[PDB]
Design a protein around this motif. Structure first.
Motif, PDB file in Angstrom:
ATOM      1  N   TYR A  98       0.813  -1.206   0.000  1.00 29.12           N
ATOM      2  CA  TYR A  98       0.000   0.000   0.000  1.00 29.12           C
ATOM      3  C   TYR A  98       0.850   1.261   0.000  1.00 29.12           C
ATOM      4  CZ  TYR A  98      -3.628  -3.343   0.931  1.00 29.12           C
ATOM      5  OH  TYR A  98      -4.495  -4.408   0.838  1.00 29.12           O
ATOM      6  N   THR A  99       2.109   1.138  -0.402  1.00 36.00           N
ATOM      7  CA  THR A  99       3.019   2.261  -0.519  1.00 36.00           C
ATOM      8  C   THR A  99       3.537   2.304  -1.940  1.00 36.00           C
ATOM      9  OG1 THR A  99       5.065   1.088  -0.113  1.00 36.00           O
ATOM     10  CG2 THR A  99       3.811   1.796   1.795  1.00 36.00           C
ATOM     11  N   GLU A 100       3.876   3.499  -2.402  1.00 33.60           N
ATOM     12  CA  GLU A 100       4.587   3.587  -3.664  1.00 33.60           C
ATOM     13  C   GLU A 100       6.024   3.119  -3.479  1.00 33.60           C
ATOM     14  OE1 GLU A 100       4.244   7.367  -5.449  1.00 33.60           O
ATOM     15  OE2 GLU A 100       2.050   7.324  -5.532  1.00 33.60           O
ATOM     16  N   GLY A 101       6.610   2.610  -4.561  1.00 37.84           N
ATOM     17  CA  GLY A 101       7.916   1.981  -4.447  1.00 37.84           C
ATOM     18  C   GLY A 101       9.034   2.990  -4.283  1.00 37.84           C
ATOM     19  N   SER A 102       9.266   3.806  -5.305  1.00 37.16           N
ATOM     20  CA  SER A 102      10.289   4.839  -5.240  1.00 37.16           C
ATOM     21  C   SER A 102       9.726   6.019  -4.467  1.00 37.16           C
ATOM     22  CB  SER A 102      10.735   5.272  -6.633  1.00 37.16           C
ATOM     23  OG  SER A 102      11.694   6.312  -6.541  1.00 37.16           O
ATOM     24  N   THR A 103      10.504   6.498  -3.485  1.00 30.02           N
ATOM     25  CA  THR A 103      10.130   7.567  -2.554  1.00 30.02           C
ATOM     26  C   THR A 103       8.846   7.179  -1.817  1.00 30.02           C
ATOM     27  OG1 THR A 103      11.209   9.130  -4.047  1.00 30.02           O
ATOM     28  CG2 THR A 103       9.898  10.057  -2.303  1.00 30.02           C
ATOM     29  N   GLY A 104       8.990   6.188  -0.946  1.00 29.16           N
ATOM     30  CA  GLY A 104       7.836   5.523  -0.391  1.00 29.16           C
ATOM     31  C   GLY A 104       7.012   6.371   0.544  1.00 29.16           C
ATOM     32  N   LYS A 105       5.969   6.993   0.014  1.00 28.13           N
ATOM     33  CA  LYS A 105       5.033   7.741   0.828  1.00 28.13           C
ATOM     34  C   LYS A 105       3.821   6.872   1.087  1.00 28.13           C
ATOM     35  CE  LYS A 105       2.737  10.230  -2.918  1.00 28.13           C
ATOM     36  NZ  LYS A 105       2.559  11.588  -3.490  1.00 28.13           N
ATOM     37  N   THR A 106       2.900   7.386   1.877  1.00 29.58           N
ATOM     38  CA  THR A 106       1.782   6.582   2.322  1.00 29.58           C
ATOM     39  C   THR A 106       0.470   7.193   1.877  1.00 29.58           C
ATOM     40  OG1 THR A 106       1.621   7.747   4.413  1.00 29.58           O
ATOM     41  CG2 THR A 106       3.063   5.816   4.313  1.00 29.58           C
ATOM     42  N   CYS A 107      -0.602   6.486   2.223  1.00 28.77           N
ATOM     43  CA  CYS A 107      -1.942   6.997   1.995  1.00 28.77           C
ATOM     44  C   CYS A 107      -2.221   8.208   2.857  1.00 28.77           C
ATOM     45  CB  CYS A 107      -2.968   5.913   2.289  1.00 28.77           C
ATOM     46  SG  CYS A 107      -3.024   5.451   4.029  1.00 28.77           S
ATOM     47  N   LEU A 108      -1.627   8.254   4.049  1.00 25.18           N
ATOM     48  CA  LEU A 108      -1.861   9.366   4.958  1.00 25.18           C
ATOM     49  C   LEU A 108      -1.290  10.658   4.403  1.00 25.18           C
ATOM     50  CD1 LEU A 108      -2.964  10.345   7.558  1.00 25.18           C
ATOM     51  CD2 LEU A 108      -0.764   9.864   8.615  1.00 25.18           C
ATOM     52  N   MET A 109      -0.079  10.594   3.851  1.00 22.42           N
ATOM     53  CA  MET A 109       0.534  11.777   3.263  1.00 22.42           C
ATOM     54  C   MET A 109      -0.249  12.248   2.049  1.00 22.42           C
ATOM     55  SD  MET A 109       4.493  10.617   3.650  1.00 22.42           S
ATOM     56  CE  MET A 109       5.063   9.977   5.218  1.00 22.42           C
ATOM     57  N   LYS A 110      -0.763  11.303   1.257  1.00 24.96           N
ATOM     58  CA  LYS A 110      -1.635  11.650   0.140  1.00 24.96           C
ATOM     59  C   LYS A 110      -2.932  12.272   0.625  1.00 24.96           C
ATOM     60  N   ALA A 111      -3.411  11.838   1.789  1.00 26.13           N
ATOM     61  CA  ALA A 111      -4.610  12.429   2.358  1.00 26.13           C
ATOM     62  C   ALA A 111      -4.347  13.857   2.793  1.00 26.13           C
ATOM     63  CB  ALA A 111      -5.095  11.595   3.536  1.00 26.13           C
ATOM     64  N   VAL A 112      -3.208  14.080   3.440  1.00 26.46           N
ATOM     65  CA  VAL A 112      -2.879  15.399   3.959  1.00 26.46           C
ATOM     66  C   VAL A 112      -2.576  16.365   2.823  1.00 26.46           C
ATOM     67  CG1 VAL A 112      -1.212  16.591   5.444  1.00 26.46           C
ATOM     68  CG2 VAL A 112      -2.218  14.484   6.161  1.00 26.46           C
ATOM     69  N   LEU A 113      -2.043  15.865   1.709  1.00 32.16           N
ATOM     70  CA  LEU A 113      -1.876  16.709   0.531  1.00 32.16           C
ATOM     71  C   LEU A 113      -3.198  17.166  -0.062  1.00 32.16           C
ATOM     72  CD1 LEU A 113       1.076  14.927  -1.222  1.00 32.16           C
ATOM     73  CD2 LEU A 113       1.019  17.228  -0.360  1.00 32.16           C
ATOM     74  N   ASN A 114      -4.273  16.428   0.168  1.00 35.67           N
ATOM     75  CA  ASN A 114      -5.548  16.682  -0.482  1.00 35.67           C
ATOM     76  C   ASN A 114      -6.544  17.085   0.592  1.00 35.67           C
ATOM     77  OD1 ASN A 114      -4.644  16.022  -3.110  1.00 35.67           O
ATOM     78  ND2 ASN A 114      -4.722  13.865  -2.509  1.00 35.67           N
ATOM     79  N   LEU A 115      -6.693  18.389   0.786  1.00 36.35           N
ATOM     80  CA  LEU A 115      -7.533  18.930   1.842  1.00 36.35           C
ATOM     81  C   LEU A 115      -8.706  19.662   1.223  1.00 36.35           C
ATOM     82  CD1 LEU A 115      -4.792  20.200   4.228  1.00 36.35           C
ATOM     83  CD2 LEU A 115      -6.293  18.260   4.544  1.00 36.35           C
ATOM     84  N   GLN A 116      -9.902  19.360   1.706  1.00 37.05           N
ATOM     85  CA  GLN A 116     -11.124  19.981   1.215  1.00 37.05           C
ATOM     86  C   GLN A 116     -11.424  21.159   2.130  1.00 37.05           C
ATOM     87  N   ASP A 117     -11.033  22.356   1.673  1.00 36.20           N
ATOM     88  CA  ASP A 117     -11.304  23.638   2.336  1.00 36.20           C
ATOM     89  C   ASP A 117     -10.721  23.682   3.744  1.00 36.20           C
ATOM     90  N   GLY A 118      -9.521  23.151   3.896  1.00 34.30           N
ATOM     91  CA  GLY A 118      -8.807  23.231   5.139  1.00 34.30           C
ATOM     92  C   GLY A 118      -8.900  21.994   6.000  1.00 34.30           C
ATOM     93  N   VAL A 119      -9.789  21.060   5.673  1.00 37.71           N
ATOM     94  CA  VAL A 119      -9.990  19.864   6.480  1.00 37.71           C
ATOM     95  C   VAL A 119     -10.112  18.650   5.572  1.00 37.71           C
ATOM     96  CG1 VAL A 119     -11.010  20.927   8.529  1.00 37.71           C
ATOM     97  CG2 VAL A 119     -12.424  20.398   6.564  1.00 37.71           C
ATOM     98  N   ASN A 120     -10.170  17.489   6.214  1.00 38.91           N
ATOM     99  CA  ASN A 120     -10.316  16.208   5.547  1.00 38.91           C
ATOM    100  C   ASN A 120     -10.913  15.259   6.568  1.00 38.91           C
ATOM    101  OD1 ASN A 120     -10.175  13.930   3.956  1.00 38.91           O
ATOM    102  ND2 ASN A 120      -7.952  14.008   3.670  1.00 38.91           N
ATOM    103  N   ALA A 121     -11.977  14.573   6.180  1.00 40.52           N
ATOM    104  CA  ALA A 121     -12.778  13.846   7.145  1.00 40.52           C
ATOM    105  C   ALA A 121     -12.238  12.466   7.467  1.00 40.52           C
ATOM    106  CB  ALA A 121     -14.211  13.712   6.633  1.00 40.52           C
ATOM    107  N   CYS A 122     -11.418  11.890   6.602  1.00 37.66           N
ATOM    108  CA  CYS A 122     -11.038  10.493   6.753  1.00 37.66           C
ATOM    109  C   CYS A 122      -9.938  10.268   7.774  1.00 37.66           C
ATOM    110  CB  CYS A 122     -10.590   9.935   5.403  1.00 37.66           C
ATOM    111  N   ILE A 123      -9.426  11.323   8.399  1.00 37.43           N
ATOM    112  CA  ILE A 123      -8.148  11.221   9.093  1.00 37.43           C
ATOM    113  C   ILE A 123      -8.318  10.552  10.444  1.00 37.43           C
ATOM    114  CG2 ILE A 123      -6.108  12.450   9.779  1.00 37.43           C
ATOM    115  CD1 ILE A 123      -7.046  14.722   7.978  1.00 37.43           C
ATOM    116  N   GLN A 124      -9.212  11.086  11.270  1.00 41.54           N
ATOM    117  CA  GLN A 124      -9.513  10.444  12.547  1.00 41.54           C
ATOM    118  C   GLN A 124     -10.091   9.034  12.418  1.00 41.54           C
TER     119      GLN A 124
END
Ligand SMILES: C=C(C)[C@]12C[C@@H](C)[C@@]34O[C@](Cc5ccccc5)(O[C@@H]1[C@@H]3C=C(COC(=O)Cc1ccc(O)c(OC)c1)C[C@]1(O)C(=O)C(C)=C[C@@H]41)O2
Lengths: 595, 92, 72, 131
Positions: A36-62
């Protein structure tokens, strides 16, 4: 599925993520697994979530953090870091600070984020291109991007209190990073000084015992010294002339001793600027600085008054070695005249050994500083050169070709007398201008003539086998000393024309052009060179000039936050202002104006 | 007035430079051949043009001519920088 | 600017090559997908990168960016 | 200001009314697209405006410049080089170099998608110069 999962988090739909927890319960794998990580420069789903914020927040985090907590993940999701040499150690929290969201920061800290986690990738380094350097810690990132609330939060959080004492791989702290990001623009200047002051007040509140300026990096440099080193002007200026009207006035450096009409006397602290201490600020402006604006730093008040005092104390010692070196050149002119000559020549060999030992002690002690100094170390090079030439001429005269080296060393000694022109103002101005020009542009003109001269000398040698005698005939022709004929004559005229009406002409124009660029800043270079002189003199000869005095008077200014009083060394300077009655009177410490 | 001002600016300094180099070259030719006084008069009338070995003499000539060019360019740019820095209204 | 111009002259001449040709010269930049047109077919273009540093960015907010993370 | 406003309005209108046709591709009898033509006569301001265009419209495909990502003061901009690369026949760079007749070519040199490209190619070919 991972693509499904990334579309969920970029969508930010919580109910679309529902059942994935049961999917993980059945799957019996972990969210930190490489699938569930990308191979080169292994980031996560969480970092992808934090990059994608809907008007300052994101509901899936908690719910996502709850899913990982219920998953029995030994290493939690939040503290996971990237992998790449371009990008190592980067976190969700760094992103959240960069995307300017206090709420996500509070959430991550409330779910056990790291605060000391630091990013050591190639992107997070100062030397590269298209890269960003802030130090490495999150608190440093909040500071550099002018988010005062996040700084207050990270200091004041219950869970993981940030540490100003903490420092990165290079040992730089927050103040060091604020130094490193400083440039010449006005907004940067105001932001850096406001942040710096607020940080000093907060560090006073939280760790009163520690002196935050005291901590050096791996290079042994405190933030004042590092501010000096990179040619950082404005923050350096503000750090010297620094006064707090706060209860924490002890952090400040400037003081008013008494005030009486337009006359008042200012006190400055001088603890780092003292030439007595190892790694003085003056030695670092002088030697180790590679800055183009190193002249610009010197104009500031405590530096100017201190160098003026030291130089006016110094002038007889300057005149002493002026006459001593003139008498040495007189004795060597006499021994060259009489070549009674024998004992004089023995004394000249002694003097050559003396100048050799002096320049040997100079360059032997500091080598990497000589590599840094080579842009402007032009004088001591010529001194070592004259010493070596005199050594060779005396040793060979003790044993047929010693007379060319002898006449070279004599000419170079009587021209090395020009070093001592720096004492007076205008003579030092002219000599420093000449020395700085001759480094910049004269070397270019020297290279151009030699190729044409070699060509014309070999030309006459083939036309009319010693290349030396060919150059002899050529320069005797060009200087006018001595001598198909018509074609050759025409070529000579053309060659002579180019020789003087091109190189000399263009070079002179360039020098004039160069002077304009360096114009209206000479006084500063003049003031600077005297600093080098006094520091050297402070250094002394092979017979040493040790036990140099302190610069200031000791005066206990107020009390510390600790109960002990604070003795400091301070340099007092007078000032006369006529706008004074508009302003209110400053806080003073001495009542009676006497002494 | 400008001539006297520029003379007071440059003359003593450039004369001390040229005297130092002249005594150097004079004692040099004295060792090369005539004491420093006679070699000084001979060198002074040599540069004015009044009046292995050839290699050494030409190397002395090359060094003196290019060094004299350096000093002449220096006095030129010093007079230029002083004049550019000079106030030009107050001559009246 | 004149020095940049002279370097431009020189780099074009050296890319032309000697008497032997400098042929099969590499196309600069990288092919990407910028998007789709008003036509339903997508846009595909060659592209080149550049870096900038600007401190007024808190005064004027960020524009739209296709690439999420800094890549290579 | 007149020229850039009118030019952009005309591009938007031509997008609206003749969508299939790419207007800037059409050459003259001398065979020059308007970018090449603006380069050749040495007109500067319109040239600068043509290289780095943006459109917040639904049609941003007209625009050339983009942003890859942005992070603090750092941001990474894309450019197109669909006519600018020296690979192609009758490039902009060949026109600025040879076919031009303008005095002010040097000012046209120092522009961002030109400058970074020239630096890349120059440092690509330092060793052949020393050879
Ligand atoms: C590049 C260098 C180091 C240099 C080495 C020698 C050859 C030198 O000629 C020059 C250039 C030159 C070459 C040939 C003919 C004339 C000048 O200048 C100095 C160098 C230039 C002179 C004039 O002295 C100076 O440089 C001024 C000066 C003195 C003391 C200083 O501390 C100083 O630094 C601020 C500058 C001295 C010579 O050594 C000399 O008397 C002879 C034999 C020729 C001089 O070359």
């Amino acid at each position: 599925d991972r693509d499904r999962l990334f579309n969920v988090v970029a969508r930010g739909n919580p109910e679309d993520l529902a059942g994935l927890l049961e999917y993980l319960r059945r799957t019996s794998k972990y969210l930190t697994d490489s699938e569930y990580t990308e191979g080169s420069t292994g980031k996560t789903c969480l970092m992808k979530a934090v990059l994608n914020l809907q008007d300052g927040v994101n509901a899936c985090i908690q719910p996502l953090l709850e899913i990982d907590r219920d998953s029995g993940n030994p290493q939690p999701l939040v503290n996971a870091q990237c992998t790449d040499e371009y990008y190592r150690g980067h976190s969700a929290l760094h992103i959240a600070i960069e995307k300017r969201s206090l709420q996500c920061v509070k959430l991550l800290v409330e779910n056990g984020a790291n605060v000391h986690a630091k990013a050591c990738g190639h992107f997070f380094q100062k030397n590269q291109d298209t890269c960003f350097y802030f130090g490495e810690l999150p608190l440093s990132l909040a500071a550099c991007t002018k988010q005062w609330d996040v700084v207050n939060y990270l200091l004041e959080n219950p869970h993981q209190p940030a540490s100003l004492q903490a420092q990165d791989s290079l040992g730089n702290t927050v103040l060091h990073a604020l130094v490193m990001i400083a440039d010449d623009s006005a907004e940067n200047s105001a932001l850096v000084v406001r942040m710096y002051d607020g940080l000093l007040q907060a560090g006073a509140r939280l760790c009163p015992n520690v002196q935050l300026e005291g901590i050096p990096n791996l290079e042994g440099l405190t933030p004042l010294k590092l501010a000096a080193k990179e040619g950082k002007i404005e923050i350096f200026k503000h750090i010297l002339q620094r006064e707090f009207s706060a209860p924490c006035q002890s952090l400040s450096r400037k003081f008013t001793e008494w005030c009486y009409g337009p006359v008042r006397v200012s006190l400055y602290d001088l603890a780092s600027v003292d030439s007595w201490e190892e790694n003085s600020v003056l030695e670092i402006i002088a030697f180790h600085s590679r800055s183009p604006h190193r002249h610009r730093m010197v104009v500031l008040e405590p530096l100017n008054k201190l160098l003026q005092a030291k130089w006016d104390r110094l002038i007889p010692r300057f005149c002493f070695n002026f006459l001593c070196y003139l008498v040495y050149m007189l004795i060597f002119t006499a021994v060259a005249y009489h070549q009674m000559l024998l004992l004089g020549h023995i004394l000249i060999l002694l003097g050559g050994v003396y100048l050799l030992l002096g320049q040997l002690w100079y360059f032997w002690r500091r080598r990497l500083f000589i590599w840094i100094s080579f842009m402007d170390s032009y004088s001591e090079i010529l001194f070592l050169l004259q010493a070596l030439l005199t050594v060779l001429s005396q040793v060979l005269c003790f044993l047929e070709w010693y007379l060319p080296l002898l006449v070279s060393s004599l000419a170079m000694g009587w021209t090395n007398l020009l070093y001592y022109t720096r004492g007076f103002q205008h003579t030092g101005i002219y000599s420093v201008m000449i020395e700085k020009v001759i480094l910049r542009d004269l070397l270019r003109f020297l290279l151009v003539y030699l190729v044409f001269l070699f060509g014309f000398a070999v030309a006459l040698v083939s036309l009319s086998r010693s290349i030396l005698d060919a150059s002899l005939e050529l320069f005797k022709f060009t200087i006018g000393m001595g001598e198909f004929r018509g074609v050759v004559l025409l070529l000579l005229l053309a060659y002579v024309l180019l020789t003087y009406v091109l190189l000399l002409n263009m070079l002179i124009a360039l020098m004039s052009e160069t002077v304009n660029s360096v114009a209206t800043d000479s006084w500063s270079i003049w003031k600077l060179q005297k600093a080098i002189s006094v520091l050297e003199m402070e250094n002394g000869y092979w017979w040493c000039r040790r036990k140099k005095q302190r610069a200031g008077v000791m005066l206990t200014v107020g009390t510390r936050p600790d109960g002990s009083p604070d003795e400091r060394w301070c340099f007092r300077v007078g000032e006369m202002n006529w706008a004074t009655w508009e302003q209110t009177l400053p806080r003073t410490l001495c009542e009676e104006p006497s002494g | 007035v400008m001539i006297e001002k520029v003379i007071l600016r440059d003359l003593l300094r450039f004369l001390l430079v040229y005297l130092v180099f002249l005594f150097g070259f004079a004692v040099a030719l004295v060792s090369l051949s005539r004491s420093i006084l006679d070699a000084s008069l001979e060198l002074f009338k040599f540069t004015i043009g009044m009046g292995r070995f050839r290699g050494v003499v030409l190397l002395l000539l090359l060094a003196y001519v290019l060094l004299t060019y350096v000093l002449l360019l220096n006095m030129l740019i010093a007079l230029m920088s002083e004049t550019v820095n000079s106030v030009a209204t107050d001559s009246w």
